[PDB]
Short mmCIF file of C-alpha atoms and ligand atoms in Angstrom, two decimals:
data_model
loop_
_atom_site.label_atom_id
_atom_site.label_comp_id
_atom_site.label_asym_id
_atom_site.label_seq_id
_atom_site.Cartn_x
_atom_site.Cartn_y
_atom_site.Cartn_z
CA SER A 192 6.87 78.49 137.15
CA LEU A 193 10.24 80.23 137.58
CA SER A 194 13.59 78.87 138.81
CA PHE A 195 16.72 80.62 140.05
CA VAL A 196 20.17 79.12 139.41
CA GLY A 197 23.50 80.48 140.72
CA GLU A 198 24.09 81.16 144.42
CA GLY A 199 21.56 80.38 147.16
CA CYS A 200 18.58 82.69 147.56
CA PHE A 201 15.79 82.45 150.14
CA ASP A 202 13.20 84.71 148.45
CA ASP A 203 10.95 84.37 145.41
CA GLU A 204 12.79 84.19 142.11
CA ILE A 205 12.11 87.77 140.93
CA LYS A 206 13.42 89.23 144.23
CA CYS A 207 16.59 87.17 143.78
CA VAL A 208 17.16 88.65 140.31
CA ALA A 209 16.61 92.15 141.71
CA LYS A 210 19.25 91.42 144.36
CA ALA A 211 21.74 90.11 141.79
CA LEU A 212 21.33 93.17 139.57
CA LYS A 213 21.71 95.45 142.61
CA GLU A 214 25.04 93.75 143.40
CA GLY A 215 26.39 94.35 139.88
CA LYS A 216 26.07 90.79 138.59
CA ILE A 217 25.01 89.54 135.14
CA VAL A 218 21.61 87.82 135.00
CA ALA A 219 20.53 85.52 132.18
CA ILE A 220 16.77 85.80 131.85
CA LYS A 221 14.48 83.44 129.96
CA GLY A 222 11.91 85.59 128.15
CA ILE A 223 9.48 84.95 125.30
CA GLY A 224 11.82 84.40 122.37
CA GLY A 225 14.93 83.25 124.21
CA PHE A 226 17.46 84.22 126.87
CA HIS A 227 18.72 87.76 127.45
CA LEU A 228 21.58 89.17 129.53
CA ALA A 229 20.94 91.97 132.07
CA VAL A 230 22.93 94.29 134.35
CA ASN A 231 22.18 97.57 136.14
CA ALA A 232 22.48 100.18 133.33
CA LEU A 233 23.71 102.74 135.91
CA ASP A 234 26.49 100.45 137.15
CA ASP A 235 29.70 101.10 135.18
CA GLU A 236 31.50 98.08 136.69
CA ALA A 237 28.69 95.63 135.82
CA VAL A 238 28.48 96.94 132.25
CA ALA A 239 32.30 96.70 132.08
CA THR A 240 32.37 93.04 133.21
CA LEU A 241 29.72 92.14 130.61
CA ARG A 242 31.84 93.92 127.95
CA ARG A 243 34.86 91.90 129.10
CA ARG A 244 32.93 88.61 129.26
CA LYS A 245 31.52 88.93 125.75
CA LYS A 246 34.86 90.44 124.65
CA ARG A 247 33.92 90.18 120.96
CA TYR A 248 30.99 92.60 120.97
CA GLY A 249 31.68 96.36 120.68
CA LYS A 250 28.03 96.92 119.68
CA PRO A 251 25.86 99.23 121.83
CA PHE A 252 23.55 97.64 124.38
CA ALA A 253 19.81 98.03 124.40
CA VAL A 254 18.31 99.10 127.71
CA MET A 255 14.99 98.26 129.32
CA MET A 256 13.15 101.01 131.19
CA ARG A 257 9.97 100.75 133.34
CA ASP A 258 7.74 103.23 131.47
CA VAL A 259 7.65 106.15 129.04
CA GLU A 260 8.27 108.70 131.83
CA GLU A 261 11.62 107.00 132.52
CA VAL A 262 12.50 107.01 128.80
CA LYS A 263 11.73 110.76 128.50
CA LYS A 264 14.44 111.29 131.15
CA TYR A 265 17.16 109.71 129.01
CA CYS A 266 15.85 110.13 125.45
CA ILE A 267 13.83 112.30 123.09
CA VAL A 268 10.46 110.60 122.59
CA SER A 269 8.04 111.89 119.93
CA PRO A 270 4.44 110.57 119.82
CA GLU A 271 5.19 108.08 117.01
CA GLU A 272 8.17 106.80 118.95
CA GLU A 273 5.96 106.45 122.04
CA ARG A 274 3.45 104.49 119.97
CA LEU A 275 6.27 102.09 118.95
CA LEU A 276 7.47 101.73 122.55
CA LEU A 277 3.98 101.11 124.02
CA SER A 278 2.97 98.81 121.16
CA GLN A 279 2.11 95.20 122.08
CA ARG A 280 4.73 94.30 119.54
CA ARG A 281 7.13 95.65 122.17
CA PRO A 282 10.33 96.29 120.24
CA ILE A 283 13.57 98.06 121.05
CA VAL A 284 13.17 101.57 119.63
CA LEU A 285 16.29 103.52 118.60
CA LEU A 286 16.00 107.00 120.13
CA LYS A 287 18.06 110.20 120.33
CA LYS A 288 19.79 110.67 123.70
CA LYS A 289 19.22 113.66 126.02
CA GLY A 290 22.70 114.11 127.57
CA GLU A 291 24.90 111.38 129.08
CA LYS A 292 23.04 110.02 132.11
CA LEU A 293 23.69 106.25 131.77
CA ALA A 294 26.84 104.25 132.58
CA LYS A 295 29.85 104.19 130.22
CA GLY A 296 29.97 101.15 127.93
CA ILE A 297 26.25 101.10 127.07
CA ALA A 298 26.35 103.24 123.95
CA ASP A 299 29.56 105.33 123.99
CA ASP A 300 30.38 107.95 121.31
CA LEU A 301 26.84 107.51 119.89
CA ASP A 302 23.94 109.98 120.04
CA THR A 303 21.28 107.21 120.06
CA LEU A 304 20.06 104.58 122.48
CA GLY A 305 17.94 101.48 121.96
CA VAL A 306 15.20 101.39 124.61
CA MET A 307 12.52 98.78 125.21
CA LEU A 308 9.64 98.61 127.70
CA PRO A 309 8.64 95.56 129.77
CA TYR A 310 6.91 92.91 127.66
CA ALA A 311 6.39 89.78 129.79
CA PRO A 312 4.87 89.48 133.27
CA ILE A 313 8.38 88.82 134.67
CA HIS A 314 9.54 92.34 133.67
CA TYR A 315 6.67 94.16 135.36
CA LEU A 316 7.45 92.16 138.52
CA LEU A 317 11.15 92.93 138.18
CA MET A 318 10.46 96.65 137.76
CA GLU A 319 8.78 97.09 141.14
CA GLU A 320 11.87 95.59 142.85
CA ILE A 321 14.49 97.82 141.16
CA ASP A 322 14.79 101.56 140.52
CA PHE A 323 17.30 101.67 137.64
CA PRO A 324 17.23 100.94 133.89
CA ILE A 325 18.71 97.61 132.81
CA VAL A 326 20.78 96.47 129.86
CA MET A 327 18.82 93.82 127.94
CA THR A 328 21.15 92.30 125.38
CA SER A 329 20.78 89.04 123.48
CA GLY A 330 21.68 85.88 125.43
CA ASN A 331 24.64 84.75 123.34
CA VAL A 332 28.43 84.70 123.39
CA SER A 333 29.35 87.01 120.48
CA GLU A 334 26.49 87.19 117.89
CA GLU A 335 25.19 83.66 117.13
CA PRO A 336 21.50 82.79 117.65
CA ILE A 337 20.36 83.43 121.19
CA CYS A 338 19.84 80.51 123.54
CA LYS A 339 16.33 79.14 124.02
CA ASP A 340 16.56 76.03 126.20
CA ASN A 341 17.52 75.99 129.88
CA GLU A 342 20.36 73.45 129.56
CA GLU A 343 21.69 75.13 126.38
CA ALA A 344 21.82 78.51 128.18
CA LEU A 345 23.43 77.07 131.33
CA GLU A 346 26.33 75.74 129.21
CA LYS A 347 26.78 78.43 126.53
CA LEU A 348 26.48 81.37 128.96
CA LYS A 349 28.51 79.80 131.83
CA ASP A 350 31.38 82.31 131.46
CA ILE A 351 29.04 85.29 131.03
CA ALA A 352 26.07 85.11 133.40
CA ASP A 353 26.49 84.88 137.17
CA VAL A 354 22.91 83.74 137.74
CA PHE A 355 19.92 82.53 135.72
CA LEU A 356 16.17 83.03 135.76
CA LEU A 357 14.72 79.92 134.14
CA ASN A 358 11.24 78.49 133.61
CA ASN A 359 9.69 75.14 132.67
CA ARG A 360 7.93 76.33 129.49
CA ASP A 361 9.74 75.36 126.30
CA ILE A 362 10.42 78.02 123.73
CA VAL A 363 9.80 76.20 120.46
CA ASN A 364 10.87 78.92 118.07
CA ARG A 365 13.61 81.24 119.25
CA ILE A 366 13.11 84.84 118.17
CA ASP A 367 15.09 87.97 118.92
CA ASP A 368 13.88 91.35 120.10
CA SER A 369 12.84 93.64 117.28
CA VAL A 370 14.72 96.88 116.73
CA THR A 371 12.88 99.75 115.10
CA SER A 372 12.76 103.57 114.86
CA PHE A 373 10.86 106.52 113.46
CA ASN A 374 12.39 108.80 110.83
CA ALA A 375 11.31 110.83 107.81
CA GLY A 376 7.62 110.46 108.73
CA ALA A 377 7.53 106.64 108.74
CA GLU A 378 8.57 103.67 110.87
CA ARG A 379 12.01 102.37 109.81
CA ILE A 380 12.60 98.90 111.18
CA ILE A 381 16.22 97.76 111.65
CA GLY B 1 37.20 79.29 86.89
CA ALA B 2 39.29 76.23 85.94
CA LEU B 3 36.33 73.85 85.42
CA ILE B 4 38.80 71.79 83.43
CA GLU B 5 38.88 69.33 86.36
CA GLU B 6 35.15 68.83 85.74
CA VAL B 7 35.78 67.91 82.07
CA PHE B 8 38.53 65.56 83.31
CA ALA B 9 36.20 63.89 85.83
CA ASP B 10 33.45 63.29 83.26
CA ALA B 11 35.60 61.60 80.59
CA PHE B 12 37.85 59.48 82.80
CA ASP B 13 34.92 58.63 85.10
CA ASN B 14 35.58 55.46 87.13
CA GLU B 15 35.89 54.15 90.74
CA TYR B 16 39.48 55.45 91.09
CA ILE B 17 38.70 58.94 89.79
CA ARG B 18 35.36 59.40 91.64
CA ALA B 19 37.26 58.69 94.87
CA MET B 20 39.46 61.81 94.43
CA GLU B 21 42.41 60.30 96.34
CA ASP B 22 46.02 61.56 96.53
CA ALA B 23 46.90 58.30 94.79
CA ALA B 24 45.12 55.38 93.10
CA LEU B 25 45.40 52.07 94.96
CA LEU B 26 46.05 49.27 92.49
CA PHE B 27 46.06 45.49 93.04
CA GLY B 28 45.28 46.32 96.66
CA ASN B 29 48.89 46.93 97.69
CA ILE B 30 50.47 49.35 95.23
CA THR B 31 49.78 53.02 94.81
CA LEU B 32 50.09 55.39 91.79
CA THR B 33 50.17 59.18 91.56
CA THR B 34 51.13 61.93 89.13
CA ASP B 35 51.76 65.67 89.41
CA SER B 36 53.02 68.50 87.20
CA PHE B 37 55.14 71.33 88.58
CA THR B 38 54.90 74.80 87.08
CA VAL B 39 56.21 77.01 89.91
CA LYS B 40 57.78 80.41 89.13
CA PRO B 41 60.40 81.29 90.16
CA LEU B 42 62.23 77.99 89.61
CA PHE B 43 64.64 78.81 92.44
CA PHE B 44 63.15 80.21 95.63
CA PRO B 45 64.17 80.47 99.28
CA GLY B 46 64.26 76.97 100.77
CA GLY B 47 64.07 75.08 97.48
CA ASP B 48 63.63 74.82 93.72
CA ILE B 49 61.38 73.16 91.10
CA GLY B 50 63.54 70.00 91.22
CA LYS B 51 63.24 69.32 94.94
CA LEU B 52 59.56 70.15 94.65
CA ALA B 53 58.93 67.73 91.77
CA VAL B 54 60.34 64.82 93.78
CA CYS B 55 58.98 65.62 97.25
CA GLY B 56 55.44 66.33 96.08
CA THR B 57 55.12 62.98 94.36
CA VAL B 58 56.95 61.12 97.13
CA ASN B 59 54.41 62.69 99.48
CA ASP B 60 51.37 61.95 97.29
CA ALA B 61 52.58 58.33 96.93
CA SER B 62 52.65 57.93 100.74
CA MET B 63 49.30 59.60 101.55
CA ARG B 64 47.58 56.26 101.13
CA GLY B 65 49.63 54.63 103.94
CA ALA B 66 52.52 53.62 101.73
CA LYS B 67 56.27 53.49 101.28
CA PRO B 68 57.10 55.23 97.99
CA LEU B 69 59.74 53.39 95.94
CA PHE B 70 59.81 54.36 92.26
CA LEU B 71 59.36 57.59 90.35
CA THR B 72 59.17 58.76 86.78
CA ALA B 73 60.51 62.15 85.71
CA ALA B 74 59.29 64.03 82.65
CA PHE B 75 60.93 67.30 81.60
CA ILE B 76 59.53 69.79 79.11
CA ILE B 77 62.28 72.33 78.33
CA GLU B 78 62.41 75.61 76.41
CA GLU B 79 64.95 75.96 73.59
CA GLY B 80 68.02 77.69 75.04
CA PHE B 81 67.18 77.19 78.73
CA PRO B 82 70.50 77.64 80.58
CA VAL B 83 72.09 74.24 81.10
CA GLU B 84 73.71 75.24 84.43
CA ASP B 85 70.24 75.90 85.86
CA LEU B 86 69.24 72.45 84.60
CA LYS B 87 72.21 70.78 86.32
CA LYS B 88 71.07 72.45 89.56
CA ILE B 89 67.47 71.22 89.14
CA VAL B 90 68.55 67.66 88.32
CA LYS B 91 71.01 67.62 91.27
CA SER B 92 68.20 68.76 93.62
CA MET B 93 66.05 65.94 92.25
CA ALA B 94 68.84 63.42 92.81
CA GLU B 95 69.31 64.62 96.42
CA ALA B 96 65.59 64.48 97.26
CA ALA B 97 65.15 60.95 95.86
CA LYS B 98 68.18 59.85 97.88
CA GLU B 99 66.77 61.34 101.12
CA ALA B 100 63.34 59.86 100.40
CA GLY B 101 64.99 56.46 99.74
CA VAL B 102 63.33 56.46 96.32
CA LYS B 103 64.58 55.85 92.75
CA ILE B 104 63.73 57.50 89.44
CA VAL B 105 63.44 54.55 87.08
CA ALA B 106 61.92 55.95 83.90
CA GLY B 107 61.50 59.31 82.25
CA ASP B 108 61.36 61.58 79.25
CA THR B 109 62.87 64.82 78.02
CA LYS B 110 61.25 67.03 75.38
CA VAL B 111 62.69 70.25 74.02
CA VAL B 112 60.19 72.76 72.57
CA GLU B 113 60.66 75.97 70.49
CA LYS B 114 61.68 79.17 72.26
CA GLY B 115 58.47 80.69 73.68
CA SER B 116 56.41 77.48 73.77
CA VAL B 117 57.04 77.09 77.48
CA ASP B 118 58.28 79.48 80.18
CA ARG B 119 61.72 77.93 80.79
CA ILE B 120 60.89 74.46 82.21
CA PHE B 121 58.02 72.28 83.50
CA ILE B 122 58.44 68.93 85.22
CA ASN B 123 56.03 66.06 85.71
CA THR B 124 56.66 63.22 88.13
CA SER B 125 54.74 60.01 88.72
CA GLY B 126 55.21 57.72 91.69
CA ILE B 127 54.74 54.12 92.77
CA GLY B 128 54.51 53.10 96.42
CA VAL B 129 53.71 49.92 98.34
CA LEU B 130 51.14 49.83 101.17
CA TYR B 131 52.19 48.95 104.73
CA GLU B 132 50.76 45.81 106.36
CA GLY B 133 47.48 47.17 107.77
CA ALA B 134 47.18 50.50 106.01
CA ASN B 135 43.75 51.91 105.23
CA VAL B 136 44.09 55.60 104.51
CA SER B 137 41.55 57.42 102.34
CA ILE B 138 39.79 60.85 102.26
CA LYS B 139 36.58 58.85 102.84
CA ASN B 140 37.69 57.43 106.22
CA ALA B 141 36.93 60.25 108.67
CA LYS B 142 34.22 59.49 111.28
CA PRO B 143 32.79 61.91 113.91
CA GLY B 144 35.00 61.79 117.02
CA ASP B 145 38.27 61.58 115.09
CA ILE B 146 41.06 64.06 115.81
CA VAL B 147 42.73 66.29 113.23
CA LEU B 148 46.45 67.00 113.41
CA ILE B 149 48.89 69.01 111.29
CA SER B 150 52.57 67.94 111.09
CA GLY B 151 53.90 71.53 111.36
CA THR B 152 53.53 75.24 110.59
CA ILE B 153 50.96 76.37 108.03
CA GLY B 154 51.54 78.51 104.93
CA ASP B 155 55.31 78.41 104.50
CA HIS B 156 55.62 77.47 100.84
CA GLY B 157 52.70 79.62 99.63
CA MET B 158 54.05 82.74 101.28
CA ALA B 159 57.66 82.00 100.29
CA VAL B 160 57.08 81.75 96.52
CA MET B 161 54.60 84.67 96.71
CA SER B 162 57.34 86.78 98.34
CA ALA B 163 59.97 85.82 95.77
CA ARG B 164 57.64 85.92 92.73
CA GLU B 165 56.03 89.27 93.52
CA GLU B 166 59.19 90.86 94.98
CA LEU B 167 57.50 91.49 98.32
CA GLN B 168 60.08 92.41 100.95
CA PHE B 169 59.27 91.36 104.52
CA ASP B 170 60.86 92.09 107.90
CA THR B 171 61.80 88.38 108.00
CA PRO B 172 62.66 86.36 104.86
CA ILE B 173 60.29 83.40 104.43
CA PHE B 174 61.58 80.00 103.34
CA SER B 175 59.69 77.20 101.63
CA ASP B 176 59.10 74.02 103.63
CA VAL B 177 59.69 71.55 100.75
CA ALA B 178 60.41 68.15 102.26
CA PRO B 179 59.77 64.42 101.69
CA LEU B 180 57.44 63.17 104.41
CA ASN B 181 57.47 59.46 103.67
CA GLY B 182 59.77 58.98 106.70
CA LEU B 183 57.32 60.76 109.00
CA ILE B 184 54.38 58.85 107.47
CA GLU B 185 56.25 55.55 107.95
CA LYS B 186 56.42 56.28 111.72
CA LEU B 187 52.74 57.22 111.76
CA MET B 188 51.76 54.03 109.94
CA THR B 189 52.91 52.23 113.09
CA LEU B 190 49.39 53.15 114.24
CA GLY B 191 47.86 51.08 111.41
CA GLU B 192 44.09 51.42 110.95
CA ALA B 193 43.87 54.19 113.58
CA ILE B 194 45.36 56.45 110.91
CA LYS B 195 42.28 57.29 108.87
CA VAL B 196 43.21 60.18 106.53
CA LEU B 197 46.49 61.59 105.24
CA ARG B 198 46.77 64.57 102.88
CA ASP B 199 49.34 67.26 102.16
CA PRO B 200 47.76 70.75 102.07
CA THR B 201 49.16 71.94 98.76
CA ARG B 202 47.07 73.94 96.23
CA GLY B 203 44.43 75.66 98.40
CA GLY B 204 46.16 75.03 101.75
CA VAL B 205 44.73 73.46 104.90
CA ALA B 206 41.25 74.89 104.25
CA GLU B 207 40.87 72.94 101.00
CA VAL B 208 42.02 69.65 102.52
CA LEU B 209 39.44 69.93 105.35
CA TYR B 210 36.69 70.57 102.79
CA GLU B 211 37.87 67.59 100.76
CA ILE B 212 37.76 65.45 103.91
CA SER B 213 34.27 66.82 104.67
CA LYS B 214 32.92 66.20 101.18
CA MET B 215 34.28 62.66 100.79
CA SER B 216 33.87 61.39 104.35
CA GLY B 217 30.48 63.11 104.62
CA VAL B 218 31.43 64.80 107.89
CA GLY B 219 32.32 68.21 109.34
CA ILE B 220 35.54 69.50 110.87
CA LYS B 221 36.18 71.90 113.68
CA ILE B 222 39.54 73.53 114.13
CA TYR B 223 40.95 75.82 116.83
CA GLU B 224 42.59 79.17 116.06
CA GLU B 225 44.88 79.12 119.14
CA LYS B 226 46.10 75.62 118.23
CA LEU B 227 47.19 76.41 114.65
CA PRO B 228 50.98 76.41 114.15
CA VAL B 229 52.37 79.27 112.08
CA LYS B 230 55.75 81.00 111.91
CA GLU B 231 55.59 84.63 113.03
CA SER B 232 57.03 85.67 109.67
CA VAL B 233 54.09 84.04 107.88
CA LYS B 234 51.59 85.35 110.47
CA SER B 235 52.46 89.04 109.98
CA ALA B 236 53.07 88.72 106.22
CA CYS B 237 49.47 87.48 105.89
CA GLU B 238 48.22 90.04 108.45
CA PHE B 239 49.74 92.81 106.33
CA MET B 240 47.89 91.70 103.20
CA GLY B 241 44.74 90.41 104.93
CA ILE B 242 45.38 86.80 103.85
CA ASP B 243 44.28 83.62 105.69
CA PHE B 244 47.28 81.26 106.00
CA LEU B 245 44.74 78.44 105.80
CA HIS B 246 44.65 79.15 102.06
CA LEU B 247 48.40 79.28 101.40
CA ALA B 248 50.13 76.14 100.10
CA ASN B 249 52.49 73.85 102.05
CA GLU B 250 55.07 71.39 100.66
CA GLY B 251 56.50 69.82 103.83
CA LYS B 252 53.28 69.24 105.79
CA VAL B 253 50.64 66.57 106.21
CA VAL B 254 47.13 66.80 107.67
CA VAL B 255 46.31 63.71 109.70
CA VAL B 256 43.01 62.31 110.89
CA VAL B 257 43.19 59.61 113.63
CA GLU B 258 41.11 57.61 116.09
CA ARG B 259 40.41 59.57 119.26
CA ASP B 260 42.46 57.28 121.56
CA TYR B 261 45.54 57.38 119.29
CA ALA B 262 45.83 61.16 118.83
CA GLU B 263 48.31 61.64 121.68
CA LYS B 264 50.50 58.87 120.22
CA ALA B 265 50.29 60.39 116.74
CA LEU B 266 51.46 63.77 118.05
CA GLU B 267 54.39 62.28 119.84
CA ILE B 268 55.34 60.19 116.83
CA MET B 269 55.46 63.40 114.79
CA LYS B 270 57.18 65.55 117.45
CA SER B 271 60.05 63.04 117.61
CA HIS B 272 60.64 63.34 113.84
CA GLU B 273 62.76 66.06 112.18
CA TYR B 274 59.84 67.29 110.00
CA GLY B 275 57.30 67.04 112.83
CA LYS B 276 58.65 69.27 115.63
CA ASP B 277 55.91 71.90 115.28
CA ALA B 278 53.05 69.41 115.05
CA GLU B 279 49.75 70.20 116.77
CA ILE B 280 46.35 68.69 117.44
CA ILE B 281 44.25 71.31 115.63
CA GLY B 282 40.65 70.07 115.60
CA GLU B 283 37.93 67.42 115.64
CA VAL B 284 35.70 65.71 113.06
CA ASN B 285 32.08 66.88 113.49
CA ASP B 286 28.62 65.46 112.94
CA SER B 287 27.85 68.68 111.04
CA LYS B 288 28.68 68.62 107.36
CA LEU B 289 30.47 71.93 107.94
CA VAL B 290 34.02 73.27 108.23
CA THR B 291 34.24 75.60 111.22
CA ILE B 292 36.96 77.42 113.18
CA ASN B 293 36.75 78.39 116.86
CA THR B 294 38.49 81.50 118.16
CA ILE B 295 39.46 82.19 121.79
CA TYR B 296 36.44 82.06 124.17
CA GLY B 297 34.27 79.96 121.80
CA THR B 298 33.32 82.11 118.80
CA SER B 299 32.54 79.78 115.91
CA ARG B 300 32.62 80.75 112.22
CA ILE B 301 32.72 78.84 108.91
CA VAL B 302 36.06 78.50 107.15
CA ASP B 303 35.81 80.17 103.74
CA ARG B 304 36.85 78.22 100.63
CA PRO B 305 39.83 79.55 98.51
MG1 MG C 1 48.36 65.56 97.51
#
């Protein structure tokens, strides 16, 4: 089952996360391979505070969107790219932008954006409670291995995340999101 | 690739050598060290080869928790080396021994053909006597111990670099050459709580920490914000992309202590003329790794010189 740590919240744990995102807060989410950090990808202030709180990053953020239709609004998506997005492998796919429509600080001065689709039940549930794309960056200060255990995340990400979505299933082997692309007629994994 | 020290370690293999201490401990209470001094230029801001030859061996002879007392001085001199430069070197040696409260009791002088040595080399050996409950060794660090440095890092290294390679800086940099046996004497008030003492010479602070790690079988974590360094050294290194952790020091000691005695060790240093810039800089880890933390908690391994 899920747990919500941070400030008090009456609702079910997904609804709480939706509320926190809506308010421009950083949420640390326990997924399949570890923790990730999320904000509203249309909220410049929230993206700015995450940039400040990591402070040693600079790297562009990946963004999670609800479906292919939503991606086609922000990015150019060829059929092979759509196959990579929809794949059960569920990676981040690096895609060419279609005009600046996201918040500043996501992927500035770059013509590409890393987009992923939902991959765990928690994301599908989160998507029906929000109507904006979300940053989904690794759950780490700087660039070390992402956190995997609840107590490890609560300590390491204390100065980054405002709230946490935890669960009581151990991740045994931490594993990051894949990052791939399509170019020159073949998949090119990063 | 000076794997000469490997040939050395194979042939003179014994308990004393395997230990890789700053000084051998003989009969249980007396200590013995030796060092050669080949610095160019012979006269540099803040010192010369003479002051260096004494201080370095006085220091090495104390690093075991000891009062240094007696020194030997060996001189290897080029035919036609200016005698007025020699009088200056010898004078500097006399002055340093006097300040250290030490005496040069034996020696040697050899003169070699012109071109068989660049001007002058000096070797010094030292004898010291251990304080009552001294137990200082590079093997003595345990996890939980605190690491201190007696003052700013990288002075000597950058000073001779600047003079030798004619590098002009916005601020002139002086060498830190000093005898530290007085400072060590005040530290040895703490007895067994003082675990490790080493001067970060060839290879700087980085190399010492690795030597502590290897021999104690531990790791060490240091803190960027806590590292003392003169602004002149900071920007000199920042201009050339150098890590001051790799530059040599000649008036500094790295100290490892018991957790509860760290505050006392800092104040003992801060109340001594060569210890005003002392800082607690790190902690002895469980990890067999040498790591440095930046502001906010970004860990990375310290690279070896
Ligand atoms: Mg030494």
